[PDB]
């Protein structure tokens with residue numbers, strides 16, 4: 005059997021993450037000062053007689069500084085108050101910020117708040133073109149619309165064209181904030197990534213910065229980073245001891261990139277166990293993906309697929325040696341999961357992730373069959389198979405395993421493919437297909453999403469690209485509506501799904517695959533998040 009030529013670049017990281025020993029002295033000093041700064045900051049939030057604009061800016065700053073997870077109660081109480089008071093009487097900057105912060109937190113504030121800023125056409129008054137802070141907040145707000153917010157249809161185009169026009173002459177760091185925003189809006193960004201940029205590039209350079217907040221933000225960021233580095237070392241040791249690097253050399257070695265993905269889903273200390281479990285899964289299904297894609301024969305993949313469905317160590321003999329390696333590791337990983345959850349009495353819930361893995365692997369096999377037969381399905385049939393092969397139903401389910409307050413009813417809700425999950429899956433599917441179209445067309449993949457789309461509708465590659473973009477825009481409006489209260493499950497279980505969508509946007513920015521090619525996109529992120537501390 006002549007296998008295909010391996011052409012994945014090695015891990016760019018070597019072992020620089022394998023061993024990290026926390027300096028307990030520094031950690032305890034940071035935590036002790038953070039405790040004091042946390043209380044000071046709580047008192048800023050609870051201060052009476054604050055103006056609306058002042059309150060919204062405080063909340064926004066604390067969120068962008070990445071320290072709002074300390075104040076979920078306080079911030080919710082305040083936004084709820086603001087939501088229920090309906091004092092509609094402000095300027096563009098405050099109105100746009102009010103709208104965004106309320107919507108991001110699930111408060112269904114009416115988009116009518118923007119009507120005073122528009123003419124009879126629903127087009128924004130061009131007289132606002134010289135209000136940069138208004139334009140910026142409108143811009144950010146434009147990204148949180150649902151299907152009921154067509155009044156905001158023009159906001160993105162309007163704010164973008166005038167922000168671009170104004171940017172070169174703005175003072176710093178406002179210029180850099182505007183420029184960054186035009187490239188990466190806050191709502192669709194990975195929170196830690198935007199937080200790192202905001203702290204170091206913007207807030208630290210603001211003449212008006214609050215010193216208590218800056219200090220709090222730098223210490224908290226660097227302390228959590230210590231945890232993230234301990235987690236990544238622990239995960240690096242686990243991966244090294246699997247040695248897929250050598251025994252399965254055909255597969256992408258990207259456990260660091262997988263950790264960045266898990267960090268994007270949640271960064272908070274309380275999700276440490278959830279994070280470690282998740283990254284192991286992303287890493288392992290990545291192995292399986294490359295087994296189907298870039299190594300295994302048709303006959304081999306059939307056997308592998310059927311053994312996964314049956315899920316039993318007795319099936320290993322029916323597999324080639326190299327497939328036995330990953331197959332035992334997969335079964336082992338889930339036994340580890342059950343054991344790790346045993347003391348919380350939550351072992352039983354692991355079955356949900358297992359069934360989603362089986363689903364993924366079934367659809368991998370279908371994808372291979374199609375490729376071998378040279379079959380180009382209609383878009384509907386393509387999607388019925390390729391949505392699961394994003395792995396996103398699977399990763400979302402996996403993300404709940406370590407979350408201590410996840411219940412059976414939460415998994416039951418997720419198992420029904422709720423709308424917010426479906427949207428996140430679609431975004432991953434259509435962005436991936438837009439980015440990887442030309443590469444996979446050269447590899448002979450006649451069953452790529454874009455190809456299917458072209459042949460089905462009889463349209464050019466350009467028009468097919470656009471239709472997929474539309475599906476992405478539709479899906480983000482669905483995610484946004486999916487966050488509005490009342491929510492079908494607690495918000496804590498929506499945020500990972502939202503964050504999975506963000507990860508797509510961030511990983512495939514400027515239409516390239518940053519997971520397969522981490523050097524351009526992911527590498528600076530990983531360095532900013534997991535190598536370099538923020539200089540204090």
Ligand SMILES: O=S(=O)(O)C[C@@H](O)CN1CCOCC1
Nearest residue numbers: 289290293394395440519520
């Ligand atoms: O290279 S593609 O195969 O087109 C896209 C893959 O990166 C998708 N998987 C890989 C493993 O991590 C989860 C997503």
Ligand SMILES: [Ca+2]
Nearest residue numbers: 293294296297
């Ligand atoms: Ca693949």
Ligand SMILES: [Ca+2]
Nearest residue numbers: 436437440444
């Ligand atoms: Ca793909």
